[PDB]
């Protein structure tokens, strides 16, 4: 239906004209509708977080100590986005959070949590309550590669009152265990696990030592979250923030060991000599890492940071107070310039509802960073408390971040539908082409 979808009258204003005068926020303009011949279910909202990482869900959790720790990053990656673990912590704590995110979901679990036979049941209960993993292997000397002696699961210890008893008293013992022998393809191993009606399947060598471990929970997670952002080994994608000082070099190394796939530079004004040097050093020393430089708001800053070797750009400054730029103009300008050079952009700031996120993605941003919009969800750091009959964490309880991410997803889909394009890549292309049009709204026209 290209004859019906193609605008020839072009009654409206193109992005280039809209952003050619004064700096705009998202309320200053609206997107005009197009032609619909599809359901909102079929809309692809995906966007590039970096040159090589495509997110099924163009949403990134902001690296604030009040928003993104291991739990938030896990939720984001599971729903098809990603989270940036904040850097307001020691290097070891940040690496531990990254490791939690990366080893939450696996195919073969290579370093399965293991204990020695004399460990008390209390310790396994602590592991399950704190780290949330069951099917703890009991091996010679507790080494994750030692001889397999048994396994401890939920129903093996849920009835015992003496929490100091050794696991050897209640574990399922090796002689009675369904196991597999190295080597084995993940497909066959997991189908065997399914047929076995058990929750775990260790994989051992010829010496009965633990090679790895398969978990039914990973299969069920794959079934319940088919769009999770994953690496090539089946782990959830994870990003981590860092400043560009010389000390932070150490930090970077640690994160690289923990397995981050994206490094995000933390700066209000990223067009500095220190950030340029840092990006060069990161791309040289850890080529496998992708770097999101920023923050920037003008095309000059973007030119410098892209020349340095940035894989993506963080847009935002102001969304004492004498330096910055209205956020919608910043996004349009920087994202257009960066796209001309093949670099996607992240919108960071002033994104307070679904209409704003949609506008920010339409005017050039590939993905959007969420801070306030997801603050107070169950997955954020912090403790809940009651006050005035409201439950707060301060901000009000917004429940699960997963339900909110699904809400934002449906909102973006319906908006793209009304605009008349079945994907946001198409929306951005047609915006640059002048086939998706806008209207600036007078101040009165805003209600």
Ligand X SMILES: Nc1ncnc2c1ncn2[C@@H]1O[C@H](COP(=O)(O)OP(=O)(O)OP(=O)(O)O)[C@@H](O)[C@H]1O
Ligand Y SMILES: Nc1nc2c(ncn2[C@@H]2O[C@H](COP(=O)(O)OP(=O)(O)O)[C@@H](O)[C@H]2O)c(=O)[nH]1
Beta-bridge partners for 296: 315
- Residue 109 makes contact with ligand Y by CB under 6 A: yes
Q: Nearest CA to 304 among 338, 262, 349?
A: 338
Q: Distance of CA 280 to CAs 276, 307, 311, 312, 351, Å?
A: 6, 9, 11, 14, 31
- Residue 150 makes contact with ligand Y by CB under 6 A: no
- Residue 271 makes contact with a copy of itself by CB under 8 A: yes
- Min dist CB 228 to ligand X, Å, is 19
Total residues at interface with ligand Y (CB under 6 A): 14
- Min dist CB 281 to a copy of itself, Å, is 16
The rounded Cα 31 to chain-centroid distance in angstroms is 28
Q: Nearest CA to 362 among 143, 49, 58, 20?
A: 58
Nearer to ligand Y, 153 or 253 (CB): 153
- Residue 202 makes contact with ligand Y by CB under 6 A: no
Instruction: Report how far residue 248's alpha carbon sits from residue 350's, in angstroms, rounded to the nearest whole number.
Output: 28
- Min dist CB 129 to ligand X, Å, is 13
Q: Which of residues 155-174 bind a copy of itself (CB under 8 A)?
A: 155-156, 158-159, 172
| Vertex 111 angle, CA 110 and 114, to 5° | 135
Q: Which does 245 bind (CB under 5 to 8 A by kind): ligand X, a copy of itself, ligand Y, none?
A: none
Nearer to ligand Y, 145 or 421 (CB): 145
- Residue 43 makes contact with ligand Y by CB under 6 A: no
Nearer to a copy of itself, 90 or 400 (CB): 400
- Residue 177 makes contact with ligand X by CB under 6 A: yes
Q: Answer yes or no: is 268 a known binding residue.
A: yes
The tokens describing 193, both together, are 């696990």
The tokens describing 61, both together, are 């959790």
Which of the stretches 116-124, 128-136, 341-349, 415-423 binds ligand Y when contact is defined by CB under 6 A?
128-136
Per-residue contact track with a copy of itself, 172 to 201, x per CB under 8 A?
x---------------------x--xxx--
Which distant-in-sequence residues (6+ apart) come within 8 Å of 156 by Cβ?
170, 171, 172
The rounded Cα 167 to chain-centroid distance in angstroms is 37
Q: Distance of CA 25 to CAs 22, 224, 321, 322, Å?
A: 10, 38, 17, 17
Q: Answer yes or no: is 266 a known binding residue.
A: yes
On the 0-12 / 13-18 / 19+ scale of CB atoms within 10 A, 132 is exposed
Q: Answer yes or no: is 318 a known binding residue.
A: yes
C-beta separation of 210 from 83 below 8 A: no
Instruction: Report how far residue 383's alpha carbon sits from residue 376's, in angstroms, rounded to the nearest whole number.
Output: 10
Nearer to ligand Y, 234 or 382 (CB): 234
Which of the stretches 50-58, 108-116, 186-194, 204-212 binds ligand Y when contact is defined by CB under 6 A?
108-116
- Integer-rounded Cα Rg, in Å, for the chain is 25
- Residue 133 makes contact with ligand Y by CB under 6 A: yes
Instruction: Report how far residue 404's alpha carbon sits from residue 80's, in angstroms, rounded to the nearest whole number.
Output: 13
Beta-bridge partners for 209: 147
Which distant-in-sequence residues (6+ apart) come within 8 Å of 389 by Cβ?
none
Instruction: Report how far residue 236's alpha carbon sits from residue 57's, in angstroms, rounded to the nearest whole number.
Output: 14
Q: Answer yes or no: is 350 a known binding residue.
A: yes
SS3 assignment, position 312: strand
- Min dist CB 194 to ligand Y, Å, is 16
Q: Which of 75, 238, 404, 427 binds a copy of itself (CB under 8 A)?
A: 404
| Vertex 130 angle, CA 119 and 93, to 5° | 110
Per-residue contact track with ligand X, 134 to 173, x per CB under 6 A?
xx---------------x-xxxx---------------x-
- Residue 272 makes contact with a copy of itself by CB under 8 A: yes
- Residue 310 makes contact with ligand Y by CB under 6 A: no
Q: Answer yes or no: is 97 a known binding residue.
A: no
Binding site for a copy of itself (CB under 8 A): 1, 4, 7-12, 23, 30-37, 153, 155-156, 158-159, 172, 194, 197-199, 216, 219-220, 223, 269, 271-274, 276, 296-301, 303-304, 317-318, 322-326, 333, 337, 352-353, 373, 384, 386, 389-391, 396-399, 403-404, 407
Binding-site positions for K(+) read: 318
- Show binding-site residues for NAD(+): 266-268, 316-318
Residue ranges for the binding site?
266-268, 316-318, 348-350, 371-372
Site for ligand Y, rule CB under 6 A: 96, 99, 103, 109, 111-113, 133, 135-137, 213, 215, 217
Chain residues in the site for ligand X (CB under 6 A): 134-135, 151, 153-156, 172, 176-178, 197-201
């Amino acid at each position: 239906n290209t004859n019906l979808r193609t605008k020839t009258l072009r009654d409206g204003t193109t992005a280039e004209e809209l952003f050619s005068q004064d700096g705009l926020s998202f309320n200053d303009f609206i997107i005009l509708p197009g032609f619909i011949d599809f359901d909102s279910s079929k809309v692809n909202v995906s966007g590039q977080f970096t040159k090589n990482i495509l997110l099924h869900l163009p949403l990134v959790s902001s690296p604030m100590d009040t928003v993104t720790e291991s739990s938030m990053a896990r939720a984001m990656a599971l729903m098809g986005g990603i989270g940036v673990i904040h850097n307001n912590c020691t290097v070891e704590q940040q690496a531990r959070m990254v490791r939690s995110v990366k080893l939450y979901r696996n195919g073969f679990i290579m370093k399965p949590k293991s204990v020695s036979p004399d460990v008390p049941v209390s310790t396994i209960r602590n592991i399950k309550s704190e780290k949330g993993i069951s099917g703890i292997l009991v091996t010679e000397g507790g080494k994750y590669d030692g001889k397999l002696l048994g396994i401890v699961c939920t129903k093996d210890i849920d009835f015992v009152k003496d929490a100091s008893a050794p696991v050897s008293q209640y574990m399922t013992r090796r002689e009675n265990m369904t196991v597999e022998r190295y080597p084995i393809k993940l497909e066959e191993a997991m189908d065997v696990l399914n047929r076995s009606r058990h929750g775990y399947l260790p994989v051992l060598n010829d010496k009965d030592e633990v090679v790895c471990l398969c978990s039914r929970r990973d299969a069920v997670r794959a079934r319940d979250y088919p769009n999770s952002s994953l690496d090539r080994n089946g782990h959830l994608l994870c990003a981590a923030a860092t400043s560009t000082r010389e000390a932070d070099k150490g930090r970077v190394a640690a994160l690289s060991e923990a397995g981050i796939d994206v490094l995000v530079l933390d700066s209000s004004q990223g067009n500095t000599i220190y950030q340029v040097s840092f990006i060069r050093w990161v791309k040289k020393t850890y080529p496998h890492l992708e770097v999101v430089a920023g923050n920037v708001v003008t095309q000059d800053q973007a030119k410098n940071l892209i020349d340095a070797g940035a894989d993506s750009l963080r847009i935002g400054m102001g969304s004492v107070l004498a330096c910055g730029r209205p956020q919608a103009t910043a996004i349009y300008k920087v994202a257009r310039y960066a796209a001309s050079r093949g670099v996607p952009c992240v919108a960071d700031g002033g994104l307070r509802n679904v209409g704003d996120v949609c506008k920010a993605l339409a005017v050039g941003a590939n993905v959007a960073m969420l801070g306030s919009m997801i603050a107070g969800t169950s997955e954020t750091p912090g403790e809940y408390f009651f006050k005035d009959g409201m439950r707060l964490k301060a901000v009000l309880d917004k429940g699960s971040v997963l339900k909110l991410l699904a809400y934002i997803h449906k909102g973006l889909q319906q908006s793209a539908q009304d605009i008349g394009e079945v994907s946001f890549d198409a929306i951005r292309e047609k915006v640059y082409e002048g086939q998706v049009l806008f209207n600036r709204r007078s101040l009165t026209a805003q209600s």
